[PDB]
Structure 1
Amino acid sequence: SEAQSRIQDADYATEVSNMSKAQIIQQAGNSVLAKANQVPQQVLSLLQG
């Protein structure tokens, strides 16, 4: 049983850190997606209309 515990029974210590890092990266990705979509309208500024 202790043997089987070493292949199954994922250690939460690394898993929670991975979850936090993934969520942070997802938030950053949403932010940068918004900021990138905020770029083009400078061309409308060029059009001056």
Structure 2
Amino acid sequence: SEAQSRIQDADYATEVSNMSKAQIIQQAGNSVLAKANQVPQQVLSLLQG
């Protein structure tokens, strides 16, 4: 049983750290996506003068 624990079971510290990092990455990517879609607005300024 203890060997099966060493084989199939997961370690919660690493999982929690990885999940927190992944959530941080997701929010950061969402913000960068918003900025990227905001970038092309300069062409409207070009056209208007």
Q: Tell me the distance in 2 between the aligned counterparts of 1:47 and 1:7.
A: 63
- 1:1-49 deviation digits (Å, cap 9, x = unpaired): 0000001110001000000000000000000000000000100100016
TM-score (norm 2): 0.94
Runs of 4 or more above 6 Å deviation = none
Judging by fraction of residues, say which structure has more helix: 2
Report the number of matched residues.
49
Alignment gaps of 5+ in structure 1: none
Q: Describe the SS at the equivalent of 1:30.
A: helix
Alignment gaps of 5+ in structure 2: none
Q: Describe the SS at the equivalent of 1:38.
A: helix
Percent identity, aligned pairs only, is 100
TM-score (norm 1): 0.94
Say what the alpha-carbon RMSD is for the aligned residues.
1.0
